[PDB]
Amino acid sequence: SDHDYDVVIIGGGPAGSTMASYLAKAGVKCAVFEKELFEREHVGESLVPATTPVLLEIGVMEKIEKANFPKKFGAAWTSADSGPEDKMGFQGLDHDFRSAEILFNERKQEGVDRDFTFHVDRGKFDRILLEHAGSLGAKVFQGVEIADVEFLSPGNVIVNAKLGKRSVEIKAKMVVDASGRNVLLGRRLGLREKDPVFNQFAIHSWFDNFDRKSATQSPDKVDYIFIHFLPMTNTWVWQIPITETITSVGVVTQKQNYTNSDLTYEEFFWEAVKTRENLHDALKASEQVRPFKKEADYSYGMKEVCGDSFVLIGDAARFVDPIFSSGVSVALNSARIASGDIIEAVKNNDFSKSSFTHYEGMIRNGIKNWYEFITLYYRLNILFTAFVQDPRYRLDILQLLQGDVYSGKRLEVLDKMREIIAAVESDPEHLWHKYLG
Amino acid sequence: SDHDYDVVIIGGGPAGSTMASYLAKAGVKCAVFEKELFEREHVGESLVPATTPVLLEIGVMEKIEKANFPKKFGAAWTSADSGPEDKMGFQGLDHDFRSAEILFNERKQEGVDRDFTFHVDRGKFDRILLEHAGSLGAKVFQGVEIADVEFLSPGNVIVNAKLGKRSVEIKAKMVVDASGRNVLLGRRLGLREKDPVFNQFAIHSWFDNFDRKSATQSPDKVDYIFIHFLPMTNTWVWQIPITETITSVGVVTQKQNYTNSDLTYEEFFWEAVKTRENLHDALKASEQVRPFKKEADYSYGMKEVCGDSFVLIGDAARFVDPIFSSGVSVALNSARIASGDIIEAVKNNDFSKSSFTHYEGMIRNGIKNWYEFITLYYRLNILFTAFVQDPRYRLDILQLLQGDVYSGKRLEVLDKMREIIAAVESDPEHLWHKYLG
Ligand SMILES: Cc1cc2nc3c(=O)[nH]c(=O)nc-3n(C[C@H](O)[C@H](O)[C@H](O)COP(=O)(O)OP(=O)(O)OC[C@H]3O[C@@H](n4cnc5c(N)ncnc54)[C@H](O)[C@@H]3O)c2cc1C
Ligand SMILES: Cc1cc2nc3c(=O)[nH]c(=O)nc-3n(C[C@H](O)[C@H](O)[C@H](O)COP(=O)(O)OP(=O)(O)OC[C@H]3O[C@@H](n4cnc5c(N)ncnc54)[C@H](O)[C@@H]3O)c2cc1C
Ligand SMILES: [Cl-]
Ligand SMILES: [Cl-]
Ligand SMILES: [Cl-]
Ligand SMILES: [Cl-]
Helix, strand or coil, X not given: CCCCEEEEEECCCHHHHHHHHHHHHCCCCXXXXXXXXXXXXXXXXXXXXXXXXXHHHHCCHHHHHCCCCCEECEEEEEECCCCCCCHHHCCCCCXXXXXXXXXXXXXXXXXXXXXXXXXXXXXXXXXXXXXHHHHCCCEEEECCEEEEEEEXXXXXEEEEEECCCCEEEEEEEEEEECXXXXXXXXXXXXXEEECCCCCEEEEEEEEECCCHHHCCCCHHHCCCEEEEECCCCCCEEEEEECCCCCEEEEEEEEHHHHHHHCCCHHHHHHHHHCCCHHHHHHHHHCEECCCCEEECCCCEEECCCEECCEEECHHHCCECCCCCCCHHHHHHHHHHHHHHHXXXXXXXXXXXXXXXXXXXXXXXXXXXXXXXXXXXHHHHHHHHHHHHHCHHHHHHHHHHHCCCCCCCCCCCHHHHHHHHHHHHHHCCCCCCHHHCC | CCCCEEEXXXXXXXXXXXXXXXXXXXXXXXXXXXCCCCCCCCCCCECCHHHHHHHHHHCCHHHHHCCCCCEECEEEEEECCCCCCCHHHCCCCCCCCCEEEEEHHHCXXXXXXXXXXXXXCHHHHHHHHHHHHHHCCCEEXXXXXXXXXXXXECXXXXXXXXXXXXXXXEEEEEEEECCCCCCHHHHHCCCEEECCCCCEEEEEEEEECCCHXXXXXXXXXXXXXXXXXXXXXXXXXXXXXXXXXXXXXXXXXXXXXXXXXXXXXXXXHHHHHCXXXXXXXXXXXXXXXXXXXXXXXXXXXXXXXXXXXXXXXXXXXXXXXXXXXXXXXXXXXXXXHHHHHHHXXXXXXXXXXXXXXXXXXXXXXXXXXXXXXXXXXXXXXXXXXXXXXXXXXXHHHHHHHCCCCCCCCCCCHHHHHHHHHHHHHHCCCCXXXXXXX
């Protein structure tokens, strides 16, 4: 019916590759346009187990397993500052806000058939996923950037694909914005809404032969994600395995802390890192295999995540902050849910907003909990570990850390978090008070 | 000067990736068009050391070393039929045509700084090379097939690039045909000349946990290329390491032997392989990780390997037969030499045949020796091992097996081979006679 494709995916990352796999697997004729030549370096390494049902559902899990990514059986938090001595009657703290751990297997998660998910080289990871989408029948273009999308009619779109400085017109019944922090349709259509509260900022690189025992004694916990709290305001470091020897390490903080630093990005990394001697010395002993990258300006909302002949997924739709290592999960799950709506949209031949309403509701609520949970971490700071460790909140907290964010249940935790916040907020005498953020 | 690129490379294999690396490294604005999404399966695994000077010269060697390809320190030939007992005064045969070996380090090769080259997964190999070409500045398109090249004027060409069924016009001062056995410009311009003498044919796949000690006792020789002669006319099997566990195994023979077999490709493999019990049982014990592939119709010449605003390289220019595992070497060296001419062609702004004359002469002579050497192997059959093992011819033979085929020296070996051929040819009494092909 003079359309080149039913669907045209913009961007070939996790959000794009997955959407393409869900469509080609369901018989829909789609295409992915990736502007970069893969493999391409990308921050965002530590997966969360809500990825695996999707990875399984699309048929790519064993190809991913053959990549031999370091397994992520769980997640840790450490702080040089053990907290207040009182502990406000919190049932279990084995080290007084100093250390906290959690195994992903401690809660059963529908779809998960595993004790572990992966920490990935995001270059390798994304190639394998796009290759896979390719192998399922999806047409994939690399080195071909999408300049703009012409919105002619409901169920009728043209896409401006460029090859350097040479345009090509691609007719489609719709587009999928699976762009990154780039955000093609959010900028073009003016949907992008920069976050008012969040002004966080990240600096990271890779570190070879980085002794992961710098973070813990036990060899069972060596390949967990470690989130090292730093004494600076709203500051923490990630430690993520990439290979057996290579670790990815990034500081995250308020830009206000960096810009007042009067330092280059490299120097700020070491200076913030030097506030925790074990981390610093392990990093100094290890080998930088990559120059330091900045990641900034990444906290943004989106006025509309769907429309007539368009839907936004993954980072093209939203990003908050990388604490809980959940963004790739959202990429795959926003790609899963929006595909369910798209597969029916081509069947019904009905690409107006109404056909994508189920995705809109599902994602917005999935962003809400994800968003709220990130805010309350920064509000609690090191006091977050009291909730992680306490049985009354532990597996309710694990639910979120696992990425089970889509269901429409409230998640009573997030109010119980809010109450104990408000109890301390109110009272500046409160012993927990100076540890807040 | 309203050209999108100085050069447009057709195809993103070893020949294409390399050309692109040589051009981008020398400041020339080029582009590679690969029709497939990488990684993509490709036969042609065992490299020959004439690749390494090029791999080094383009700056990709360490990226290749990080791929951890099995090292190829040398090459072996085995036959269940030990030959005639006479040995016609050949100075050294340690097993009577039964076994022969050679180490690549036994002759010094200019550019080689190594005792070994690699056996590669050609999927991985080609991605790393095209990525590399990318990183040097070359623009790379994947999923974009080149339909045809319009030859307007010397130094002025248009290329028809398609995206499914959607054309795009790309202006260029010239094109490089780095296509495969596909052969775009050879078919379009009618340069393709199917080989009259060679009608060889190959069937192969991968085999996991394939005990490489089936071929030899010693653990030093376990990862050599092994060429197992079979009793059938012009028949031999390759054994090439791909990983620590995976081996690539292919039978090569006259199609006449297959077509008279009355068997499917799978069945012929096992039947020809069963003529050598150690090989068969090691293969039967191992795990097929891939279905069997046919490779046929690959012996072809080319009327013209260069022209006004065009040059053919690698398999787009020629292929003979895969005995000496030398085709990827030709891909890289034809890409090296033709780049030397192209780099000057853009400098001089002169893209007529005359500017590529140095490549034409160099390749044609490099094909000649490569071609002759392949013919005399098939003529000698198992008697080839007498030349491999004898000091008088050993390192002169190694020169060819190493891929030092470009120089314009005659290579006295190939006549000395021819004489001893003609001595046996003439006389059907001759003891060596029934072992010829
Ligand atoms: C500092 C930091 C740390 C993080 N840490 C983690 C972590 O530990 N764990 C985790 O799960 N997540 C993490 N994230 C989030 C994660 O990186 C993203 O959520 C994830 O990459 C989203 O995938 P995506 O496909 O939606 O977007 P991307 O992965 O960014 O993919 C977008 C793709 O679209 C392409 N593209 C863009 N524009 C165009 C165009 N016009 N035409 C064609 N192609 C285009 C891009 O080249 C890119 O390949 C982190 C983020 C930051 C900033
Ligand atoms: C049975 C067999 C065994 C072999 N064994 C060996 C061995 O052991 N060792 C060895 O060194 N060599 C071997 N070879 C030879 C080797 O495979 C080739 O010589 C080598 O692949 C040549 O590289 P190339 O880039 O010139 O062509 P290719 O590697 O074939 O690359 C060509 C590329 O161009 C692309 N292309 C084609 N048409 C178009 C178009 N219109 N637009 C855009 N892109 C296009 C293709 O998709 C492909 O990616 C063997 C060959 C055969 C048949
Ligand atoms: Cl410490
Ligand atoms: Cl995240
Ligand atoms: Cl045998
Ligand atoms: Cl070859």
